[PDB]
Amino acid sequence: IVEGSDAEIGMSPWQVMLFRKSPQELLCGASLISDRWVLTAAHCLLYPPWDKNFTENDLLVRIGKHSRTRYERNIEKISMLEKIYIHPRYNWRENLDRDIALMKLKKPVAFSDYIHPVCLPDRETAASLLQAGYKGRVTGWGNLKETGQPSVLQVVNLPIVERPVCKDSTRIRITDNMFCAGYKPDEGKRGDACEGDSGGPFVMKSPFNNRWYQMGIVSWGEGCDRDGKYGFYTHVFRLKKWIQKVIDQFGE
Amino acid sequence: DFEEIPEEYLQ
Amino acid sequence: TFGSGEADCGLRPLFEKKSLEDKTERELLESYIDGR
Numbered sequence A: 001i002v003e004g005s006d007a008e009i010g011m012s013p014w015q016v017m018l019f020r021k022s023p024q025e026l027l028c029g030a031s032l033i034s035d036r037w038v039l040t041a042a043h044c045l046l047y048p049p050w051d052k053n054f055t056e057n058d059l060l061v062r063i064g065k066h067s068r069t070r071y072e073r074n075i076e077k078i079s080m081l082e083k084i085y086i087h088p089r090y091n092w093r094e095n096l097d098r099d100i101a102l103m104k105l106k107k108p109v110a111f112s113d114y115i116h117p118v119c120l121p122d123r124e125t126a127a128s129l130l131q132a133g134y135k136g137r138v139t140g141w142g143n144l145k146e147t148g149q150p151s152v153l154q155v156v157n158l159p160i161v162e163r164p165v166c167k168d169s170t171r172i173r174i175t176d177n178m179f180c181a182g183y184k185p186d187e188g189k190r191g192d193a194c195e196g197d198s199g200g201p202f203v204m205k206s207p208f209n210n211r212w213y214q215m216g217i218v219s220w221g222e223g224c225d226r227d228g229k230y231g232f233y234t235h236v237f238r239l240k241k242w243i244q245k246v247i248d249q250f251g252e
Numbered sequence B: 001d002f003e004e005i006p007e008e009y010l011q
Numbered sequence C: 001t002f003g004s005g006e007a008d009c010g011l012r013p014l015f016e017k018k019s020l021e022d023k024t025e026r027e028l029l030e031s032y033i034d035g036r
C-alpha cells in the first residue's frame, strides 16, 4: 500500500495472508468470508506467463495477523487448503477479467477478536455504495513504493472513480467485472495498492446497517501510485452467483 | 525476513 | 459466505460490537454524502 498508514489492531479481522511453504514468503492477501472459505485473486495462484500455477499443497493461509513477518503466537491461525477453485473464465491471456478464486480450508477456523468474516454485498448494497466519489478501504502487507515492505498491516481509503476516467487511463480493455479507484492527479491526495496486496479486500461500511462489505479484490494497476493511473479491482457483486454456486455445490 | 512458523503446519 | 454475508459478518469485535470507531472510518461515511 503506498501512502497508507498502519492499521489498528482488529481493524480488518477478515484480512488473510496467503503464505508459501518453501520458500516461506508472502504471496498475496485474501479475505475470510465464512469459517471455511477464503476469497483471493486468481492471478495470485495461476499466471502462466510467469509459470505460476500453485496447488493446495503449496500454500498456507494465515488468519488474525497484524505483523507481516512474525508468527503471532496465540493470535494468528494457520490453515491448510482442501481445494482451490478458480473462475472457469478467468482471462489471464488478456486483461485479468474475472480475477477471483475461492479456497476451501481443511478445517473451519474459530473466530476471535482478530478473526471475523466480512459480508459479501447484495444487489442493493452494491447499488447504493459503488458510486464514483465514495471511498472504500484497501489493506495489505504489500510494497510501500513501486521501487519498502511494512512491518504491520497498512490501510488507505480511496475514492471510486468514474468508469470513463478509468478507461481513459489505460490501453487495457476494461470489462464490467472490474472497477477502479484512486485520487485524480488533480486532487492532491495519493494512495494505492501495490505488489503484495493483490487478492486482498477493498471494503466499504454500510451507513444503513453498519456492516462492512467487501466490494472488490485487489487485481491490477500499472505501477503503484503513479499520477494519472488507478488501481483496478474485481467487482465482487458481479461474480457473486459464481461464488454461491461453488459454495453450495462443494460445502459452506 | 519471515520468522519460522511451527513445523506442524508444513508436515 | 453468500448474500449480504454470513450473519454476524461485517461487525468487528473490537469496533462495531463495542461501539468504538477506528480513526478513518469517518472519512468513508462522510463520502457517502455523509452518513447517519
Ligand SMILES: N=C(N)c1ccc2[nH]c(Cc3nc4ccccc4[nH]3)nc2c1
Residues within 6 Å of the ligand: A027, A028, A043, A044, A192, A193, A194, A195, A196, A197, A198, A218, A219, A220, A221, A222, A223, A224, A225, A230, A231, A232
Ligand atoms: N497498483 C496497483 N493497484 C496494483 C495492484 C496489484 C498489482 N499486482 C501487480 C502485479 C503482480 N502481481 C503479483 C502477484 C503475485 C506476485 C507478484 C505479483 N506481481 N501489480 C499491481 C498493481
Ligand code: NA
Residues within 6 Å of the ligand: A182, A183, A225, A226, A227, A228, A229, A230
Ligand atoms: Na494514481
Ligand SMILES: [Zn+2]
Residues within 6 Å of the ligand: A043, A195, A196, A197, A198, A199, A219, A220
Ligand atoms: Zn497482483
